[PDB]
Design a protein around this ligand. Structure first.
Ligand SMILES: Nc1ncnc2c1ncn2[C@@H]1O[C@H](COP(=O)(O)OP(=O)(O)OP(=O)(O)O)[C@@H](O)[C@H]1O
Lengths: 583, 10
């Protein structure tokens, strides 16, 4: 009658197993102790359910305490080490000014659980009373009441966990709440011991419960473990690659160079008017983006972009904040508050899709990437700034990838992606088919130089690039150009700077140039008098020889990091400085 | 009804 194994196993039996494992020296011994607990569970299960029919009961109530980091059903506990300290100080009735109280309070980073254990052990002699199931009920209570900001009920659930458990169970309970058990055995090892297929399964369903239920019998595997509709799969990952080796790395055959967006990795699951969104760690973001075309920040706007033949699909991409007025994606690192601006409709959510894993009743994971891309084009018609196919192009040249990387950094992207056209989709696997390339930046990151010129181009107009200079050391009235740098308004402060500078630009005349600003072959469309301009902080990979600038050199992969409006124009970097820097 | 104590501590 709805019976469960967890309802018969003392949490104490779980914690003694954990203790034995943690205290065990070698991998083999650690594994042994786990197999022993597991096997008892499985044999008891068979006994408990021999007569029972169609049972959903499994190792899950234990599994989730053993791998607390993978809990997805329960929301956050919201319990601080310092909050426990206080509860424990009051409850154990410690001298409020004594070493024990203070050691719990002033705890920083011996985990807290151990410090707590050594205070508890002399004082808390009770034998434990709770089943694994009851521990789960109480943890559920904490999470649920956390979500509701019902602090008092939270205390009461905790007080039932503590006063009902032994000292040793509390040490483990604390680790289960912090979600760091410190067993000295990887979660990969845990899955391997549980079932040959546990890890593969977990990668395409970020769900311990399904993993435990479906693989409850060790001696029967699953085949064609695959991405399935409404199951969070772990994203495929890009490995770092040095530019020098790329041609080899892409197997000396054609490859894709795709835009690298720094957003939130999000997967979209679609069946009709029903949508689910999962983040990279397998959390549900459907409340924000929209379950149905009538709800949320995205779904109502993209629902009708899906072509007529499309009833079911699974997409992988990045959520970006798009600025409609400048047609620009906003970078994560800004002084400004992106989520609020998206909620205030100053920015909007844009889904940039680079992959598709299922279309209708058809699984795509084991298709060539090239085939997947073809299919992607058929999935939906893009709407700029809401749902888009990430831009890609074919290439086979190390040369072509530097071009890509140069233009990427120029447009204030932070790198590029390189992908094998024949590669298949491999959940949670890093590298393999996908590489990422970024500049080799050298910590040179604090180049503070003056804006002396600008270039109009794409976007609202607003400027696409700045020309920057260093100061000639005065006995500052003369500057020497050093580099063009991308100006795109990927952060509002660059946009605000533009409005600040607007009234100061002056037409640059090659045949009658200003004296305060000395140029190489690179001339700006407009310039600005130095006393009217602003220092920007520039990150660069290196300084290289160049006749385009007066300094006789320029910056490789430059990028504005900060607007240093906290420094007067005359605080500019000098040639003398730059010379010293090159060494 | 199978009892847990004999499956674990055995
Ligand atoms: N076009 C793309 N195709 C596949 N994956 C991508 C793409 N763009 C971004 N990603 C994933 O998103 C990540 C970017 O996240 P994030 O914003 O942290 O980047 P970052 O901090 O600028 O640098 P890094 O990429 O090294 O983390 C990439 O590392 C990659 O795993």
């Amino acid at each position: 009658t709805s019976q469960t194994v967890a309802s018969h196993v003392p949490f104490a039996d779980l914690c003694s197993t954990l203790e034995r494992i943690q205290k065990s020296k070698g991998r083999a011994e650690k594994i042994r102790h786990f197999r022993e607990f597991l096997d008892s569970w499985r044999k008891f299960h068979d006994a408990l359910h021999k007569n029972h029919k169609d049972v959903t009961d499994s190792f899950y109530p234990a599994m989730r305490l053993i791998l607390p980091q993978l809990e997805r059903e329960r929301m956050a506990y919201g319990i601080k080490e310092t909050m426990l300290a206080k509860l424990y100080i009051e409850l154990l009735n410690l001298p409020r000014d004594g070493k024990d109280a203070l050691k719990l309070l002033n705890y920083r980073t011996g985990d807290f659980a151990m410090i707590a254990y050594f205070v508890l052990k002399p004082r808390c002699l009770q034998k434990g009373s709770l089943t694994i199931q009851q521990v789960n009920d109480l943890l559920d209570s904490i999470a649920s009441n956390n979500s509701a900001k019902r602090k008092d009920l939270i205390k009461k659930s905790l007080l039932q966990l503590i006063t009902q458990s032994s000292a040793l169970e509390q040490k483990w309970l604390i680790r289960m709440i912090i979600k760091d058990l410190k067993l000295g055995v990887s979660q990969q090892t845990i899955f391997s011991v549980f079932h040959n297929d546990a890890a593969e399964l977990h990668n395409v369903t970020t769900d311990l419960e399904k993993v435990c239920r479906q693989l409850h019998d060790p001696s029967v595997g699953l085949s064609d473990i695959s991405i399935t509709l409404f199951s969070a799969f772990k994203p495929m990952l890009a490995a770092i690659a040095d530019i020098e080796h790329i041609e080899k790395d892409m197997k000396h055959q054609s490859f894709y160079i795709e835009t690298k967006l720094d957003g939130e990795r999000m997967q979209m699951h679609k069946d009709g008017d029903v949508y689910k969104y999962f983040s990279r760690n397998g959390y549900n973001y459907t409340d924000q983006f929209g379950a149905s075309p009538t709800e949320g920040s995205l779904t109502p706007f993209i629902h009708n972009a899906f072509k007529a033949d499309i009833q079911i699909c699974i997409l992988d991409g990045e959520m970006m904040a798009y600025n409609p007025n400048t047609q620009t994606f906003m970078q994560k690192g800004t002084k400004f508050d992106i989520k609020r601006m998206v909620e205030d409709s100053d920015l909007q959510t844009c889904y940039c899709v680079f992959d598709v894993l299922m279309v209708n009743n058809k699984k795509l994971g084991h298709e060539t990437l090239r085939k997947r891309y073809e299919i992607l084009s058929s999935i939906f018609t893009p709407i700029p700034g809401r749902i888009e196919i990430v831009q890609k192009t074919q290439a086979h040249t190390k040369n072509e990838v530097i071009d890509a990387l140069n233009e990427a950094i120029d447009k204030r992207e932070e790198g590029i992606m390189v992908k094998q056209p024949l590669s298949i989709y491999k959940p949670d696997k890093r590298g393999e088919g996908w590489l990422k390339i970024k500049p080799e930046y050298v910590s040179m990151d604090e180049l503070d130089i003056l804006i002396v010129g600008g270039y109009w181009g794409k976007g609202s107009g607003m400027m696409s690039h700045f020309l920057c200079a260093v100061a000639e050391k005065p006995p500052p009235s003369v500057f020497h150009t050093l580099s063009r740098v991308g100006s795109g308004c990927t952060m509002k402060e660059l946009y605000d700077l533009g409005l600040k500078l607007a009234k100061y630009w002056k037409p640059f005349h090659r045949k009658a140039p200003p004296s305060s600003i000395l140029c190489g072959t690179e001339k700006p469309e407009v310039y600005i008098e130095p006393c009217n301009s602003v220092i920007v902080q520039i990150k660069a990979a290196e300084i290289v020889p160049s006749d385009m600038y007066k300094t006789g050199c320029t910056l490789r992969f430059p990028r504005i990091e900060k607007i240093r409006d906290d420094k007067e124009w005359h605080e500019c970097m000098t040639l003398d400085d730059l010379e010293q820097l090159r060494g | 009804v199978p009892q847990w104590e004999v499956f674990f501590k055995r």
